[PDB]
Every structure is written in structure tokens, then in C-alpha cells.
Amino acid sequence: MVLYFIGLGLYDERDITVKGLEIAKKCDYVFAEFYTSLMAGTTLGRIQKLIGKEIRVLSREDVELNFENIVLPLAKENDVAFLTPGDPLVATTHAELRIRAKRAGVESYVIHAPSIYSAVGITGLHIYKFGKSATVAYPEGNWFPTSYYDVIKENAERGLHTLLFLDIKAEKRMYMTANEAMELLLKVEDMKKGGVFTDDTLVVVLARAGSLNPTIRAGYVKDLIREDFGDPPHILIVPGKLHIVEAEYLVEIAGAPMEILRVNV
Amino acid sequence: MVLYFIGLGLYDERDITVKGLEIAKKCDYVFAEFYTSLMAGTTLGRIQKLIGKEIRVLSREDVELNFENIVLPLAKENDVAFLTPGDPLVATTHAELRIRAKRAGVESYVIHAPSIYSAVGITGLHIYKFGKSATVAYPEGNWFPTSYYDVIKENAERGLHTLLFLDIKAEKRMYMTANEAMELLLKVEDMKKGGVFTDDTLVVVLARAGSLNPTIRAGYVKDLIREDFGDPPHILIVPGKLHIVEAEYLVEIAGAPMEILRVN
Ligand SMILES: Nc1ncnc2c1ncn2[C@@H]1O[C@H](CSCC[C@H](N)C(=O)O)[C@@H](O)[C@H]1O
Questions:
Q1: Domain A1-114 sits in CATH 3.40.1010.10
Q2: Cβ distance B121 to B114 under 8 Å?
Q3: Which residues take part in binding S-adenosyl-L-methionine (chain B)?
Q4: Which helix (H) or strand (E) holds B70?
Q5: Residues of B in contact with A101 (CB under 8 A)
Q6: Do residues B216 and B22 touch, judged by C-beta distance below 8 A?
Q7: Domains B1-114 and B115-264 share a fold
Q8: How far apart (Å, rounded) are the C-alpha atoms in residues A53 and A90?
Q9: Phi then psi for B121, rounded to 5 degrees?
Q10: Which of A250, B9, B84, B108 could anchor a disulfide with A256, C-beta 3.0 to 4.6 Å?
Q11: Exposed, middle or buried by CB within 10 Å (0-12, 13-18, 19+), for B9?
């Protein structure tokens, strides 16, 4: 008679919480989705072996169109789990799935797990300084979206950091790169010319957060745009003016140039 | 011969990730602090029991003044772990401790945990629409902090939600309730009169995130400022402009007034 939204965490099969696991193991049915994001540090197979349960994967339309016909029904006579990467309800559409459950007269509980939203704290940037967040999307056809560029301007203007999620084709397993993203932002700057993103903009790239060996690199576009950050997914962040302690952290941990100590503080 | 920053999670000792549990288990020395936040659903004894280790609990002074004297030293000949509530680097100054470790030639690793910063997702408010965050601090003597007021103001002009961490005086065992925060804000409103936080302001309260039954309530200040949201810890959120589905969640799940649907 219960539905459990359980987060899988950041990178691999051990990023689930001890709570999430013990609850997942005692569920009659376990569903999962990997369209919002991919657990790039593990496999479906490794997740099932840790949870010790057959895991039925769900497509975007499985969830968004038929959540109440695929998942909810089983919750009336059973305890059901719904696993998602990161922290549940972070993806903007997932919270209404709870409204669906209430509507179908189903009890729903949320078991949290690490999200990149809090994990970027490893970049050294202060969490209270992050402003609005956005996603960089590919242009295509006659559509050239650039709102994420305005988010950067409005945040940085107010001395706040911008967390930038990169385009993902979960299903086709193709990630946007930090590099790709920097090129796109450069192209946008040339269209709008607002001084928001240029070769001298300082940025932070975070890759494989959650892993014991993530990649935290900080520097100016001109030096980073062709750097090898590794395998995806990448997270791009455009900091606002830094607190000296943030810059020292980017220098000593993320390998940023001494120059940001006098340029970006 | 390494140091690990391992988050313990939101509510009880089970909010630790499987990765953090199996690593803290094999560490020679385990340190911890419980002054940056409150894990309402557990005790030191159960953490210890679950980790299978003795946890030396540090104070803010131990940490801020003697981290390099208490903890890094043991890191050259042993594997040391430093536990904290929620996520170790979020809304703490712990990231600076990594610098100390490096400057002492001690490599450090971070094991994340569920943080209250992303748990806000359970309020139904889109996490990307949150703007600059702030902390509501207790007035000390003649000193009355008010900067958090301007933060709410900036975000709301932008239409973004504001996350308000609430103060904590761990040594006195005092945890600011959302009620207390709402009262502090009202008097700042009388002070500044910037029409930012009034009796008619819609707010959201999230209490004890991480537990199976957190308290999630939304509604106008006048109705909530005296309401009992249960034990600490609490956070207070002053949303910006709502999306209809945000508002639908707040009404269906957090018990807000239907009128808030009319999202202008
Ligand atoms: N489980 C929880 N429920 C509600 N608020 C919480 C909470 N845990 C922390 N907070 C809020 O955040 C403040 C501590 S701020 C430090 C946050 C911590 N590193 C994390 O990752 O969560 C508290 O005073 C309180 O206002």
C-alpha cells in the first residue's frame, strides 16, 4: 500500500543510502528510470546485484504518460520502489508524480540521496552564492535557445554563481561536453554581445562527482575550451565574483591559475 | 594515510550512503562534528554502532582552530574519517579544511550525503528556480542581523524562490524554528518596510527532511507563524513566482490555500 521514491545518488551503485537500500530490498516491486540522467559509474546489472531485485526500467513516456497505469496499480496491494538517479523530486517533473499517487489514493514516501545540486559544493564555491540554474541545450532547425545565457548574466550581475546542466540524450547515450558547452556559449555571446561569456570568463568544470576521483578543474575559457575533462556527464559552472576563500580553493584543489586571485576576487 | 570527509545525511544514521558506510568502517580513526546541523532521528551511540567505531566528536573551536593539530596529524600513518550531518561541504566552511589538509601533504576525499539543499525538492518547488540562499541568524545583544531580508527581496524581484537556513547554537542545544524565523522577519519588515515579508506572504516550511514523515506545510505567514511544525531542524522558504504545478503540489501535498493556484 506504499510507494517509495528512492534516489540512487551521483555515480555508482554504492551512492544509494543505507536507508534507500534496506527499503528497496523489502519492496515487492522495483522500478527505475534513466532518462533524466545516467549512472555513469555503474551498470544496471551492478545495481540489481546490490539491491538483489529484478529492476524494471521505465521510459520517459512510461513515467510521464502511464505512471498511474504501470507503477501505482502495484502499490495498492504491494510496497513499490521507484528509483531515480540523484535525489528524488529534483527533476522538475517528478514532484507531480506524487500528486498522481495521492490522487490514486497511494501513500508515498521519499528517501533522499546525494544530488549534484549539493555535490558541486566540492568545487569550493559557497552554496548560498548559487543563483538560478539552467540547462544548455543544442540549437536545432530554426530553433536557437539562449535563455541559459540570460541566467548567467542575471546571476553573475548579482555576484551569484550559475550551475549549468549540459544537454543529455539519455536514450542515445550522448552527452554534451563541457567543451561543446563552452563553444555554444561563445557562439551565443557573439550573437547577444553582453560580455557575459568570453575567452576571459572564468569557469569551473566538474565531472564524475560522487566518484572518489572526480575531475574538478577551474580556469579561463581560452585555456579550458579544448581541455580533456574525461568522460561525461560534465557540469559547467560560471562563478560570480569570488570570495578569497573560494578562489584559494579553486587554486589549491581545482588547479586554477594564481591570476584569479587578483582578477576574480 | 588519508582523510575522508563523509556526510551522514539528513535525519538518521541510515541516510549515510553505502559508500560512506563501508569506508568509515575501514578507517583507523573517526572524527565528527554535530554543530553545523541537527540529525533529529539518531544519536552518537547508533552512529558509532552502525560504523562499528569510536567517534571522537569535535567542537567548532577544535575544528576551526585545531583541525590541522587534531585531525591531519593522524592522517599520515592512518586512514582518518571526518563525519558531519548532511553533506560535509554544503553551507559549511569545511571546504577550507581541504586546503589545510593539502598544505599538510594529506590527500582528502569527499563522500557526499543527502543535503537539505536538494531535499527542498520535496516541497514541490522546482529546484532550478531557487535563487541566492541565506541564513536567518539569532540577534546577539544589540546586534540584529538583517541581510537575509535583502536576499529574499532580490530573489523575489527575479521571481526566484529563497532558501533560508535557520540558525543553530549547538552548545546551547537551540535550533531556530521556522516560527522564530517568521517573527524575526516581520520585525525586520517593520524596520525596513520594504514590503518583502508580511502577514500575507506565502511561505513553505520543511521540518525534519529525511524522516519518513517530514512536515511539509505552505500558506500565508499570518496563519503559520503560530503553527506547530514539530521538532527541529526546520528551514523556511519564501517562494518567488509559482508555476501552476508548483502551486498544485503545495495545495495537494503541503496543504496550501487553493487561492494560490491563481499564479498571476
Ligand atoms: N533534515 C533537515 N530538515 C530541515 N532542515 C534541515 C535539515 N538538515 C539541515 N537543515 C537546515 O540547515 C541548517 C544547517 S546548514 C548545514 C547543512 C548541511 N551541510 C546539509 O548538507 O544539509 C539547519 O539549521 C536547518 O535550518
A1: yes
A2: no
A3: 10, 87, 90, 115-116, 166, 209, 234
A4: helix B60-70
A5: none
A6: no
A7: no
A8: 25
A9: -55, -30
A10: A250
A11: buried
Asked if the peptide bond before residue B139 counts as cis, ω within 30 degrees of 0, the response is no
Torsion over CA: A105, B254, A87, B177 (sign): negative
Across A59-185, the runs of DSSP E, i.e. the strands, are 79-84, 107-111, 134-136, 162-166, 168-169, 174-175
Residue type, A51: I
Whether B161 contacts B242, CB under 8 Å? no
Question: Count of A–B CB contacts within 8 Å?
Answer: 175
Specify the fold of A115-265: 3.30.950
Name the residue type at position A2.
V
User: Which CA distances in Å does A56 have to A29, A30, A33, A40, A71?
Assistant: 8, 6, 9, 18, 10
Interface membership of B232 toward A (CB under 8 Å): no
Three-state DSSP state, A225 = coil
Residue A209 counted as an annotated binding residue: yes
CA angle B255, B258, B262 (to 5 degrees): 135
Mutation target among B3, B12, B19 for the A interface, most CBs of A within 10 A: B19
Contacts of A197 (CB under 8 A, 6+ apart): A149, A152, A185, A186, A188, A189, A221, A238
Helix (H, G, I), strand (E, B) or coil at A120: helix
Ligand 1 atom with least separation from CA of A118: 21
Question: Residue A92 class from Cβ within 10 Å (0-12 exposed, 13-18 middle, 19+ buried)?
Answer: middle
Query: Within 13 Å of residue A109, how many CA atoms lie on the same side as its CB?
Result: 18
User: Measured on CA atoms in the order B259, B186, A127, B227, is the torsion positive or negative?
Assistant: negative
Name residue, grid cell 501513500: A107
Does residue A233 have a cis bond before it (omega within 30 degrees)? yes
Instruction: For chain A, give the residues followed by a break (C–N over 2.5 Å).
Output: none
Length of chain B measured in residues: 264
Q: Do A185 and A138 touch, CB atoms closer than 8 A?
A: no
Given CB atoms, is A114 within the 8 Å cutoff of chain B?
yes
Q: Return the CATH fold of B115-264.
A: 3.30.950
**Consecutive H or E run containing A244:** helix A244-252
From which experimental method does this structure derive? X-ray
Grid coordinates representing A176 are 554534451
End-to-end CA distance of chain A: 54
Helix or strand holding residue A204 (H, E): strand A202-207
Query: In one letter, which amino acid is A91?
Result: A
